[PDB]
Design a protein around this ligand. Structure first.
Ligand SMILES: *[C@@H]1O[C@H](CO)[C@@H](O[C@@H]2O[C@H](CO)[C@@H](O)[C@H](O)[C@H]2NC(C)=O)[C@H](O)[C@H]1NC(C)=O
Ligand SMILES: *[C@@H]1O[C@H](CO)[C@@H](O)[C@H](O)[C@H]1NC(C)=O
Ligand SMILES: *[C@@H]1O[C@H](CO)[C@@H](O)[C@H](O)[C@H]1NC(C)=O
Ligand SMILES: *[C@@H]1O[C@H](CO)[C@@H](O)[C@H](O)[C@H]1NC(C)=O
Lengths: 349, 280
C-alpha cells in the first residue's frame, strides 16, 4: 500500500517516490507494494527508452547519460522483469535470462580535473557556486543539475526567502571577477519544511535558476548520494569555499580547499564535543585537533567524498562553534537523508 | 666485602615504578657465591663477556633492582618497548651490563609500592591500597611544569551554564586549568577545558598541559596522568584546596610476583670502568 498506483494520499508523498538508484554503481531498484521492499530491475527486454522513463520519474526531467547491465552486488535474490508509470510495468521473478541488472545514470556528474587549505585550481571543484545578495557573497552551494543548486536553509531565512535577492556565480574562482550580471538569476528558493532555526535541524535548501547552466571543462555537477553508499567510518573527503581563512576574518578573494575526515556521530554527541546536538540529519567532518575546517562564509558549501572514482555530495556546511578549533568539528547537513526530498522537488516542476 | 647478595635478598622489594639503586665500590665480591646465595633463574651479559668478570676489577658496580609482574617478564627483553622498559625502567644498550633474574620466597617478600612523582603527591596522591605481592607499574608517564594545577579557577567556573568544571584554589606560583567560555548555537556559557576526556586518550594532546614522555636511562616515571574532571570540586571556592581523588590518577596497573610461591625480581648490574675486584 505504498506504490500500488493508487493516489489515496493528500500529498502524494508515497506515489512520488517508487524508483531509486542504489549504491556507487547506480543500480536501478523499484519498490514493490506486494513485498514492501526495493528490488533491482533486470535487463531482459530493457532499453534506453525505459531508462529515460525511469529518469524522468526520478526528477531528472529530460536528462540521461547512460544505461547498461552489471553483475549484481546488492545481494538480492529476487529481481523484477519488464511486462502506466515505469514502476507499474514490472513484475517479480526469481531469475532473469540476461542475468544482468540495470545500472542507470540520469546525468553525467562527479568528475573533476576554508581554514587550513590552499587555493583551488581551475576545474578542481566544478560544482562550486558563489551565491550573492546585493552583489556581496553570502553563502555557497553545489550544482546538481543544470538548473538546480543545493545550499543551506539558514542562508535564506526571511527576508532572504525571496528569490529575486539572489544570483549565482559558477566557473569563477575569484570574487573580483564575479561581475554585476555575469551570474545567473535564481527564480525560486525552496527550504526544507521541517527546518528548525534554533537547532538548525534539516538545514537544507534548493535554488532553481531561470537560466540553466552550460556545462564545460570548468562547470560540472556533483553526484547526489545513493542509498547504500557504505562509506568508511573515517572517510577521506574535501571541503571548499570562499569563507574566512581565520576566525573573525573576512571573505576570501579566491576559492580555497582542504582535505578533511568524517567523524562518527557517536563521538560528536559525546559531552566533550557536541553533547547530544547532532541529529541523524547531521554529519561531522574535520579534525578534533582543529587546524583544518570550514569558517564564516562557507555556509551552504559542499562536502564531497570520492568513491568508485566519483565525487559524491555527502553534506553541506551548516554550523559549528568557533573556527577550526579543537573539540569543535564543523557540522554539515546530511544530504543522503534529504535526497528523497530533493527528488520530490525536482520532479514536482 | 661488597655484600651484594644481602642487598639483593632484602625482602623489602620495590615495584618497577620506584626501582632502587645501590653503588658498590672499594670492596671485593665473588660472582660464583653471589649467584648461589640467590635463587637465580637466569644470568646473562650484554655487550660484555660474562667469563671476563672473574679476576677483573671495576671502578664501580651499580645495581638497579625491582619486582617483576608475572605477566610482563618478557617486557624486560632488551630492545622491547612495552610498559616496564619504557615507562618504568629503561635498560641501557650501550653500557656493559649483566641482567640477573632471581627469586625470593613469597612468604617473606614484601612489595614496596610508592609513587616517586612529586606532582602527583602534591595534588592528592597518597598510597596504593593493594594486597600483598601486588607489584605496581606505570603504563603511561606524564610530565608537567612547575606551574601545573589540575583545577579550574572558581571565578571562571562560577560563570558556566553548561559543562561547569571542578574548581579549587591553587598553590602560589602555579596557573589554573586552561578553560574558555564558548557558544554552541543558543548555548552561551558552554565551558571548554583541556585534557579531555583524559590525558591518555585526549582528542587533542596539544591542548593538554600533561605531556606524555618515556623514561630514559637512570630515571623514574614522570608521574601518573590526572583526570582533571575529578580534581577540585564542582561549584567550588577559594576556601578549598585543589586536591584530586584517588581515581583521578590514571595510566597505571598492577600484577602479582608469584610463581611456585616465589617473587621474581630483576637486578641490572652495570659495570663501570679500579679496586672493585672479583677475586673468585
Ligand atoms: C503482463 O501484463 C498483461 C497486461 O494485459 C497481463 O495480462 C492481464 O493479466 C490480468 C491478470 O493479472 C488479466 O485479468 C487480464 O485480462 C490480462 N490481460 C490480457 C490482455 O490478457 C499479463 O498477465 C502480465 N504478465 C505477467 C507475467 O504478469
Ligand atoms: C621467612 O618466613 C618463615 C615463616 O615460616 C620464617 O620461619 C623464616 O625465619 C623467615 N625468614 C626470614 C629471613 O625472614
Ligand atoms: C586497603 O583498604 C582497606 C579498606 O577496604 C584498608 O583497611 C586497608 O588499610 C588498605 N590498605 C592499604 C595498604 O592502604
Ligand atoms: C612548560 O614550560 C616550557 C618551557 O620550559 C614551555 O615551552 C611550555 O609551553 C610550558 N607548558 C605549559 C603547559 O605551560
Amino acid at each position: 500500500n505504498w506504490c500500488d498506483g493508487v493516489s489515496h494520499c493528500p500529498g502524494g508523498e508515497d506515489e512520488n517516490r517508487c524508483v531509486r538508484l542504489y549504491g556507487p554503481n547506480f543500480i536501478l531498484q523499484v519498490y514493490s507494494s506486494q513485498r514492501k521492499s526495493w528490488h533491482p530491475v533486470c535487463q531482459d527486454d530493457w532499453n534506453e527508452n525505459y531508462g529515460r522513463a525511469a529518469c524522468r520519474d526520478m526528477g531528472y526531467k529530460n536528462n540521461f547519460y547512460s544505461s547498461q547491465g552489471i553483475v549484481d552486488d546488492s545481494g538480492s535474490t529476487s529481481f523484477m522483469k519488464l511486462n502506466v508509470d515505469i514502476y507499474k510495468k514490472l513484475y517479480h521473478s526469481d531469475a532473469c535470462s540476461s542475468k544482468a541488472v540495470v545500472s542507470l545514470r540520469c546525468i553525467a556528474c562527479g568528475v573533476n580535473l576554508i581554514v587550513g587549505g590552499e587555493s583551488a585550481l581551475p576545474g578542481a571543484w566544478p560544482w562550486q557556486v558563489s551565491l550573492h545578495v546585493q552583489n556581496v557573497h553570502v553563502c555557497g552551494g553545489s550544482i546538481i543539475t543544470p538548473e538546480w543548486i543545493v545550499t543551506a536553509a539558514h542562508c535564506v531565512e526571511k527576508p532572504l526567502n525571496n528569490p529575486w535577492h539572489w544570483t549565482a556565480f559558477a566557473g569563477i574562482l575569484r570574487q573580483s571577477f564575479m561581475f554585476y550580471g555575469a551570474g545567473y538569476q535564481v527564480e525560486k528558493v525552496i527550504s526544507h519544511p521541517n527546518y528548525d532555526s534554533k537547532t538548525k535541524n534539516n538545514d537544507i535548501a534548493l535554488m532553481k535558476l531561470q537560466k540553466p547552466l552550460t556545462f564545460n571543462d570548468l562547470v560540472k555537477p556533483v553526484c547526489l548520494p545513493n542509498p547504500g553508499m557504505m562509506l568508511q567510518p573515517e572517510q577521506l573527503c574535501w571541503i571548499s569555499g570562499w569563507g574566512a581563512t581565520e576566525e573573525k576574518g573576512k571573505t576570501s578573494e579566491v576559492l580555497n580547499a582542504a582535505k578533511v575526515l568524517l567523524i562518527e556521530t557517536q563521538r560528536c554527541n559525546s559531552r566533550y564535543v557536541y553533547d547530544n546536538l547532532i541529529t541523524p540529519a547531521m554529519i561531522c567532518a574535520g579534525f578534533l585537533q582543529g587546524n583544518v575546517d570550514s569558517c564564516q562564509g562557507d555556509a551552504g558549501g559542499p562536502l564531497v567524498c570520492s568513491k568508485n572514482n566519483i565525487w559524491w555530495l555527502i553534506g553541506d556546511t551548516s554550523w559549528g562553534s568557533g573556527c577550526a578549533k579543537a573539540y569543535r568539528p564543523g557540522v554539515y547537513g546530511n544530504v543522503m537523508v534529504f535526497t528523497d526530498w530533493i527528488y520530490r522537488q525536482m520532479r514536482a516542476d | 666485602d661488597c655484600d651484594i647478595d644481602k642487598w639483593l635478598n632484602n625482602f623489602n622489594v620495590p615495584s618497577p615504578l620506584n626501582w632502587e639503586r645501590k653503588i658498590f665500590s672499594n670492596c671485593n665480591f665473588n660472582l660464583s657465591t653471589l649467584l648461589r646465595l640467590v635463587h637465580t633463574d637466569s644470568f646473562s651479559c650484554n655487550n660484555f663477556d660474562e667469563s671476563k668478570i672473574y679476576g677483573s676489577c671495576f671502578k664501580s658496580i651499580v645495581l638497579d633492582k625491582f619486582a617483576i609482574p608475572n605477566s610482563r617478564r618478557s617486557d624486560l627483553q632488551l630492545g622491547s618497548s612495552g610498559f616496564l622498559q619504557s615507562s618504568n625502567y629503561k635498560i641501557d644498550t650501550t653500557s656493559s651490563s649483566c641482567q640477573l633474574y632471581y627469586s625470593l620466597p613469597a612468604i617473606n617478600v614484601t612489595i614496596n609500592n610508592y609513587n616517586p612523582s612529586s606532582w602527583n603527591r602534591r595534588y592528592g596522591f597518597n598510597n596504593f591500597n593493594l594486597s600483598s605481592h601486588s607489584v605496581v607499574y606505570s603504563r603511561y608517564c606524564f610530565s608537567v611544569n612547575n606551574t601545573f594545577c589540575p583545577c579550574a579557577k572558581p571565578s571562571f567556573a562560577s560563570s558556566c551554564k553548561s559543562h561547569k568544571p571542578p574548581s579549587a584554589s591553587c598553590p602560589i606560583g602555579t596557573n589554573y586549568r586552561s578553560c574558555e567560555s564558548t557558544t554552541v548555537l543558543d548555548h552561551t556559557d558552554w565551558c571548554r577545558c583541556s585534557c579531555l576526556p583524559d590525558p591518555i586518550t585526549a582528542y587533542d594532546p596539544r591542548s593538554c598541559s600533561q605531556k606524555k614522555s618515556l623514561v630514559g636511562v637512570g630515571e623514574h616515571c614522570a608521574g601518573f596522568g590526572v583526570d582533571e574532571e575529578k580534581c577540585g570540586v564542582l561549584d567550588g571556592s577559594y576556601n578549598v584546596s585543589c586536591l584530586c581523588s584517588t581515581d583521578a590518577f590514571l595510566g597505571w596497573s598492577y600484577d602479582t610476583c608469584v610463581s611456585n610461591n616465589r617473587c621474581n625480581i630483576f637486578s641490572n648490574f652495570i659495570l663501570n670502568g679500579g679496586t672493585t675486584c672479583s677475586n673468585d
